[PDB]
Every structure is written in C-alpha cells, then in structure tokens.
Copies of this chain bind each other. A is one copy, B any other.
Amino acid sequence: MYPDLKGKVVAITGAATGLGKAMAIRFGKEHAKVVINYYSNTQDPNAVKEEVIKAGGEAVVVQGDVTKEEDVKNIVQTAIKEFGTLDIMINNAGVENPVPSHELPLKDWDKVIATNLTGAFLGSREAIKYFVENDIKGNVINMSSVREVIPWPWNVHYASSKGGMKLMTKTLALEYASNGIRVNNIGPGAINTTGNAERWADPKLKADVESMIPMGYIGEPEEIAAVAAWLASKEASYVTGITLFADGGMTLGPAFEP
C-alpha cells in the first residue's frame, strides 16, 4: 500500500503476540524489514517471523526485556547488524493488572511504569540517538491507549503510564522535529487480541465492553496495524506529536442510547 515502506527497517517491541504481532505482519505486507523483539522463550516469535516473511517482508527475532537498558540497546543493534540501519521504532510492549488503587502494591505500580512508560522512553531514546548520529529521518511510534485520556479505576499505574507516554511523545516530537524525526502515539480502544477475546468470551463482560464503544464492536488487531503503517509512511509526512486514537469512538464516551 505504501511504496515508501519497502525496504524500511522497523523494530517492534512485544511483537510475539497481540498488536505487536499484527504490526509486524502488516509491515511484512508493506515489504519492510522487521526486527521482532519478544520477551520470553515461552513465546513463539518464530511463528511471527514466518508470517512476516510469508506476507512479503524480511524478519529476524531478538529476545529482550524493555525494563533493561542493555536489552533495549541490543534491539537497536540487532536492526543494524541484521539489516544495516533502523528507520522506524515501535515501542509496543506493555502490561496491565487491576487492583483497587489504595491497595496497589508498589512493586505492581513499578512494573507497569517500568514496562509501559520507561521502556518506551528507552526505546525512543535509543532510536532517536541512532537517527541523529546517522542523519536518518526516522520515525517513532509509541503504543498508547485511550487510557492516556480516559481515567481507569483499578488501573492507576496503567493510566499514569499512558498519560506519561503522551507527554514523553510530545516532548520528543518537539525536541527532534528539526532533525526530521517524527514521534507519534497510537491510542487503541478495545481490541480483539487473543488474550482479550478470551477474557471477553463471557457474554456479559463482552456486552459491557461493547457498551463503552460508540461503533458497537471491538476492533481487530489489523485495524491498529493499519494506523501504524500509515503513520510510519511518508503519507504522514506532516504529522508529528499526535495521538491517533483508533478506538471505535471510545474517547467520545460510552455508546449513545437515545
């Protein structure tokens, strides 16, 4: 779809599952060269690698924990070693776990902040460093959420991580705009990743989730991957510092019932 993405090198964190996997595959369809970071050898990154190649791309995998600076550096170095450059960095890894806020253990708060916000900072930091050093007009996409604007009871750490990610992105976008580097957030609403489809199998829970979505359906991973491909492309040449919400209307509030 986007001819300019052919041959671009894109690194994606948390790409063995979910939205990261879907983005990897979509960049494959665009004939990009994808670095699939994954967290654990309990996962199946090689299946993603095969799907990216089948779709029309090239791919390698690399284990790394985005809460470890050395591992983030190694993700970037993997792009350089395997494909010779880096063009697009997608900080997608994230976690969540609900607990009443007055009871939330500090170590749970810390894990969510470290993965979701600090990890995205480190990935952004490392990619931008490389881009500035090598005069690359690179692109960073940070995977946020509707929860960068909509508060989330029982998930104060998650909300804080995404609200922080918004200002992190805006600051990096402003700081590095003169270098021709673009930095943007995607804000998904409720998406039918495997894990979410399973937890929302219960018809009552499913209906509750859908009640929050004006469009009336839970989105598919490909509908988020579409956004990432567009933002990374030169079609979005004049777009930086934004959050592009792809949420079925969730940021408007719950579905309207007359």
| Chain A interface residues (CB < 8 Å from chain B) | 1-2, 69, 100-104, 106, 109-110, 113, 117-118, 121-122, 125, 128-129, 132, 147-157, 159-168, 170-178, 180, 189, 214-216, 219, 223-224, 226-227, 230, 235-242, 244-249, 251-256, 258
Contact = CB atoms under 8 A, between A and B. Distances in A.
A248 B240 contact: yes
**Chain A binding surface, main DSSP class:** helix
Contacts of A129: 102-103
Task: Determine which residue in A101, A103, A171, A177 has the highest number of CB atoms from chain B within 10 A of its CB, and name it.
Answer: A171
Given A156-B121, A164-B160, A216-B177, A239 B235 contact: no
B162 A175 contact: no
Of the candidates A69, A160, A189, A248, the one having the most CB atoms from chain B within 10 angstroms of its own CB is A160
A143 to B, nearest CB: 15
Contacts of A226: 235-237
Q: Name, among A162, A246, A253, A258, the residue most crowded by chain B CB atoms within 10 Å (CB to CB).
A: A253
20 contacts: A1-B1, A101-B171, A121-B157, A151-B241, A151-B252, A153-B175, A159-B167, A159-B170, A161-B164, A163-B164, A170-B252, A173-B252, A174-B214, A174-B252, A177-B252, A178-B216, A178-B256, A226-B236, A227-B236, A230-B235
A151 B253 contact: yes
A240 B258 contact: no
A129 B101 CA distance: 9
Taken together, the copies of this chain in the complex come to: 4
A214 B240 contact: yes
Contacts of A159: 167-168, 170-171
A147 B167 contact: yes
Nearest to A104: B125
B106 A69 contact: yes
B246 A238 contact: yes
A153 B162 CA distance: 19
B244 A238 contact: no
A6 to B, nearest CB: 14
